Amino acid sequence: SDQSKPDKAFGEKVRAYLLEHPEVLMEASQKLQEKQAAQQAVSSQKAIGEYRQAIERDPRDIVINPAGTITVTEFFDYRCGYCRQATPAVLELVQKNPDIRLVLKDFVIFGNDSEAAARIALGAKDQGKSLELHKALMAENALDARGALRIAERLGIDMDKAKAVGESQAITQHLADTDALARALNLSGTPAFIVGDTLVPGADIDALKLAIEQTRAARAKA
Amino acid sequence: SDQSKPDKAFGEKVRAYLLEHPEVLMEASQKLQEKQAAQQAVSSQKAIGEYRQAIERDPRDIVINPAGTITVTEFFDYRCGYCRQATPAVLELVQKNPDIRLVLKDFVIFGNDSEAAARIALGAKDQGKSLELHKALMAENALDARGALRIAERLGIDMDKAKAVGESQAITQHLADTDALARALNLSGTPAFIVGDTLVPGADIDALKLAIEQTRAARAKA
Amino acid sequence: SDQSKPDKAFGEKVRAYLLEHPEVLMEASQKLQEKQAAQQAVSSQKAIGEYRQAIERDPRDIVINPAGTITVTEFFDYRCGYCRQATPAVLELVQKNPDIRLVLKDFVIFGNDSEAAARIALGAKDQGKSLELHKALMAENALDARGALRIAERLGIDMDKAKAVGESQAITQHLADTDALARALNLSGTPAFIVGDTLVPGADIDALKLAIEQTRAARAKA
Numbered sequence: 001s002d003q004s005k006p007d008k009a010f011g012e013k014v015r016a017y018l019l020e021h022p023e024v025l026m027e028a029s030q031k032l033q034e035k036q037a038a039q040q041a042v043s044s045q046k047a048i049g050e051y052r053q054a055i056e057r058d059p060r061d062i063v064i065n066p067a068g069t070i071t072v073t074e075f076f077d078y079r080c081g082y083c084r085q086a087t088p089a090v091l092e093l094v095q096k097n098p099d100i101r102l103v104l105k106d107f108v109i110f111g112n113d114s115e116a117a118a119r120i121a122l123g124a125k126d127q128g129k130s131l132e133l134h135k136a137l138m139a140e141n142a143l144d145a146r147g148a149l150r151i152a153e154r155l156g157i158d159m160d161k162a163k164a165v166g167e168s169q170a171i172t173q174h175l176a177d178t179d180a181l182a183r184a185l186n187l188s189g190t191p192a193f194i195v196g197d198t199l200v201p202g203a204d205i206d207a208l209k210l211a212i213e214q215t216r217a218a219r220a221k222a
Numbered sequence: 223s224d225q226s227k228p229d230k231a232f233g234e235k236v237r238a239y240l241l242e243h244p245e246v247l248m249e250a251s252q253k254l255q256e257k258q259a260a261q262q263a264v265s266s267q268k269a270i271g272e273y274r275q276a277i278e279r280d281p282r283d284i285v286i287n288p289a290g291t292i293t294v295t296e297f298f299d300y301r302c303g304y305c306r307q308a309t310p311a312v313l314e315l316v317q318k319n320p321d322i323r324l325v326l327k328d329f330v331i332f333g334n335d336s337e338a339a340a341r342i343a344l345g346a347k348d349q350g351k352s353l354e355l356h357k358a359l360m361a362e363n364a365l366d367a368r369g370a371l372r373i374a375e376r377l378g379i380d381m382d383k384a385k386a387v388g389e390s391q392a393i394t395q396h397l398a399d400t401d402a403l404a405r406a407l408n409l410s411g412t413p414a415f416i417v418g419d420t421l422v423p424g425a426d427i428d429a430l431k432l433a434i435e436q437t438r439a440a441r442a443k444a
Numbered sequence: 445s446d447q448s449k450p451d452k453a454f455g456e457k458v459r460a461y462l463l464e465h466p467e468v469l470m471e472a473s474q475k476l477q478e479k480q481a482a483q484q485a486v487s488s489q490k491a492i493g494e495y496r497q498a499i500e501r502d503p504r505d506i507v508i509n510p511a512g513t514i515t516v517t518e519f520f521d522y523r524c525g526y527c528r529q530a531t532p533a534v535l536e537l538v539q540k541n542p543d544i545r546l547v548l549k550d551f552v553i554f555g556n557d558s559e560a561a562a563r564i565a566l567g568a569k570d571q572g573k574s575l576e577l578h579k580a581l582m583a584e585n586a587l588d589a590r591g592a593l594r595i596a597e598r599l600g601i602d603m604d605k606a607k608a609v610g611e612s613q614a615i616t617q618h619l620a621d622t623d624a625l626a627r628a629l630n631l632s633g634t635p636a637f638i639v640g641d642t643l644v645p646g647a648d649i650d651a652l653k654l655a656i657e658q659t660r661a662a663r664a665k666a
Contacts, residue, residue, distance in 0.1 A: 010239070011243065013455075014236055014458055017458050018247075019249055019250055019253055022257075024459045025247065025250055027463055029466070032466045032469070035466075229457065236462070240472045241471055244472035
């Protein structure tokens with residue numbers, strides 16, 4: 001060709017169709033949304049793999065069943081209702097599958113009370129009562145800072161030493177770095193589970209069970 | 223046919239038109255919005271008909287001119303400015319058209335003050351001073367709970383008995399069930415008028431007048 | 445023609461293309477956004493020209509280097525961080541280009557503290573210390589009403605007379621009319637610069653420098 005040649009009749013027919021069947025635009029918008037979601041999924045799993053050393057293998061982290069082969073990281077806040085309602089199931093899942101390694105990240109999204117519960121937990125970490133304290137703190141309906149201390153006291157934790165480690169600048173740096181890790185993983189809130197490349201946003205227990213099964217099978221393929 | 227045959231030239235012409243006349247997408251989006259609005263209108267009128275027994279014929283409700291053939295239900299809050307500015311016109315409309323039956327639903331959307339005005343009105347319901355108390359409460363600019371009591375006192379209402387009925391668990395259940403009815407009718411706020419199948423959202427006096435005329439004519443067709 | 449003749453095959457091909465290349469809709473949406481932005485730009489510059497007498501030539505306004513040919517109007521709030529960070533550069537720009545006439549509009553968007561700083565500045569206007577007071581008020585990190593008075597006192601301003609003029613009903617009308625002018629210019633916040641027909645929304649120093657150059661060149665074309 002050597003000439004741009006307009007075709008008004010073709011355009012009129014295009015407009016007529018679109019106006020008479022505008023649902024085509026909804027369908028195309030849905031295609032684009034599925035495209036955008038797949039892009040986000042790829043970015044999330046690439047980030048999970050980039051920071052896996054920090055997500056799954058941080059010495060400062062509280063780890064339930066450190067023998068586990070499959071590492072499930074949980075970002076949580078001790079006063080988030082979704083975290084509290086998912087906690088019993090998470091602990092039952094570690095209870096029934098010993099090959100699970102549960103990394104507990106303290107992702108404080110609320111105020112001083114939640115920060116206080118996290119610091120107590122991290123201070124008592126090395127006294128070997130993390131499973132019980134985690135379950136008990138999550139069990140209190142309206143967990144205060146005073147309540148958190150009373151719960152940790154009622155479990156025989158060395159309170160003087162747990163409080164000393166909790167407020168230390170090391171625990172402060174630990175929590176700050178965890179907040180940074182959540183930001184790098186583009187997390188939106190709590191709970192947020194990370195198993196394999198998968199990210200489970202929220203208290204979606206069934207999805208987390210499925211992801212653990214997938215990772216067990218995939219890692220078993222060797 | 224036996225073969226899917228691509229046509230890149232047709233698609234290029236489609237893209238060219240859309241990019242050169244993207245207003246077609248606005249026009250199609252407008253068509254879809256009109257479709258969605260008509261769907262919502264149908265759902266609203268079907269719901270109004272489903273719960274008509276509760277909307278128009280609840281013995282606990284305050285009813286102005288119970289003789290009326292045409293039932294106009296109003297969901298209102300005594301401290302909503304739109305309700306207060308529409309009230310004089312609503313009462314003039316019942317004043318000039320005796321065949322109107324005005325059901326007064328107390329749809330408390332604000333705090334304790336509004337709840338207090340509603341309870342006083344429902345407590346004094348059976349003392350035969352509802353029109354006057356409704357108009358006077360709506361007339362006070364900054365209606366407090368103290369103010370509402372002073373208004374009801376200045377109208378000769380038996381205050382000891384009106385206060386006794388107001389706080390009763392019956393009035394509490396009445397208000398709770400009304401809040402539920404508004405939720406089932408997908409109401410967004412106050413005022414909200416319901417005449418025939420029509421729902422008038424807000425202080426749209428002209429639309430309400432028109433809807434009463436339509437229902438009078440339709441019910442007169444027998 | 446004498447007949448509307450449907451063409452289902454043409455419409456199916458349109459739908460197929462759109463679903464297989466829905467990015468065409470994003471591209472068309474971008475075209476429409478560029479169209480809407482150009483419309484807004486035209487409306488803004490037409491409004492700037494309509495109210496130029498008020499923007500650039502209001503006797504009550506504080507004006508730095510009133511000799512300047514090029515009038516740059518700034519809407520600002522003494523406690524807006526963007527205004528405080530842009531202020532040093534604005535003053536350096538007047539410092540290096542004498543032909544600039546800087547009109548200072550007090551666009552109070554915050555509470556009493558900002559209103560107090562503006563009233564002090566407008567009260568001291570006629571004592572010939574506006575450049576210094578403007579720079580000093582903008583220099584205080586957490587400017588209070590008490591702080592603003594201490595800054596104006598530390599600059600030798602006649603405090604009794606500056607305070608008398610500040611609270612006067614004239615200064616109140618001045619600020620109210622400025623708030624009205626910003627509303628007529630559809631301003632969204634502070635800072636907001638106006639030079640020639642151009643409106644620079646925010647602390648976009650480079651754009652403001654460019655706009656001053658353009659206006660200098662255009663007005664020099666005679």
